[PDB]
Design a protein around this ligand. Structure first.
Ligand code: 3Y6
Length: 265
């Protein structure tokens, strides 16, 4: 069944794969290594934006943040182009999710305040959603580079799925803020070859990707069936057998997602 197919994907890509799809009223949970730890990588940027939204009025989105070239210490497709002008908190949220912008993520972490440049506050926000598992210990780009087995900067497919479920389908955020998070994930630019590539075109997919060393490739998504039925899909992977320089394999995530989509259809 599904377990054997996931295991064959692991063999095919020389990878470790984790999958979680929460149960619904009519479907069973799908789980494969769902309670094993995997590095967040940039998937944390989605609940990070939720934390900032939660903690502030909507007018906070229009606050201008200034930063320097030396502040850019991670891949930052949007922030690279706005050193002179700055970026608003809302623009940083947009960039963090839609382009996986690392400087935007670090500035949003800083905006949360507190120890660890915001990382403790972020972890605290997850705790407020009942996630006692995940932890963020570093900012970008260090958080994507911990050795396999290190618990720093890790979550589990199970844990992050339940968090994303509350944020997008639940009531963790009031409707107006929830709609912002959902819109940013819906217009993500980095996910076409991952969960999106596993679901037929008549399914809606919103997502946030993560990529790291040791061949890390993650994607977390909410998907809607052609009749409007929602599901949460978390897929995480690494290729520790290839060492630090191992190439991430998007096709592994696309194949895993295709397996999931077939079961959910
Ligand atoms: C100081 C210079 N330096 C050094 C290392 N570094 C870094 O490791 N970045 C990982 C990363 O940002 N990851 C974010 C993802 C990201 C964001 C934007 C683009 C890309 C891309 O691959 O094109 C990837 B996240 O935390 O998941 C990363 C790790 C492995 C990769 O194959 C790609 C990027 C830097 O960004 C960096 O600026």
């Amino acid at each position: 069944a599904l377990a054997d197919r996931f295991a064959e994907l692991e063999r095919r890509y020389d990878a470790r794969l984790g999958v979680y799809v929460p149960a619904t009223g009519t479907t069973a949970a799908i789980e494969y290594r769902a309670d094993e730890r995997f590095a967040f990588c940039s998937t944390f940027k989605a609940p990070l934006v939720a934390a900032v939204l939660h903690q502030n009025p909507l007018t906070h989105l229009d606050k201008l943040i200034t930063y320097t070239s030396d502040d850019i210490r991670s891949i930052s497709p949007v922030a690279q182009q706005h050193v002179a002008t700055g970026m608003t908190i809302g623009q940083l949220c947009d960039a963090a999710i839609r382009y996986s912008d690392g400087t935007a993520a670090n500035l949003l972490l800083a905006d949360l305040g507190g120890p660890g440049g915001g990382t403790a506050a972020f972890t605290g926000y997850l705790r407020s959603l009942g996630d006692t598992v995940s932890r963020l210990d570093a900012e970008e780009p260090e958080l994507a580079r911990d050795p396999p087995g290190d618990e720093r900067d890790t979550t589990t497919p199970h844990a992050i799925a339940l968090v994303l479920q509350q944020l997008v389908l639940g009531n963790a955020l009031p409707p107006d803020k929830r709609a912002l998070l959902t819109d940013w994930m819906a217009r993500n630019t980095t996910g076409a070859k991952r969960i999106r590539a596993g679901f037929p075109a008549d399914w809606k997919v919103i997502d946030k990707t993560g990529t790291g060393d040791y061949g890390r490739a993650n994607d977390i998504a909410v998907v809607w069936s052609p009749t409007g039925v929602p599901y949460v899909v978390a897929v995480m992977s690494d290729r520790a057998g290839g060492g630090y320089d191992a190439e991430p394999r998007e096709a592994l995530l696309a194949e895993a997602a295709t397996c999931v989509a077939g079961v959910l259809a």
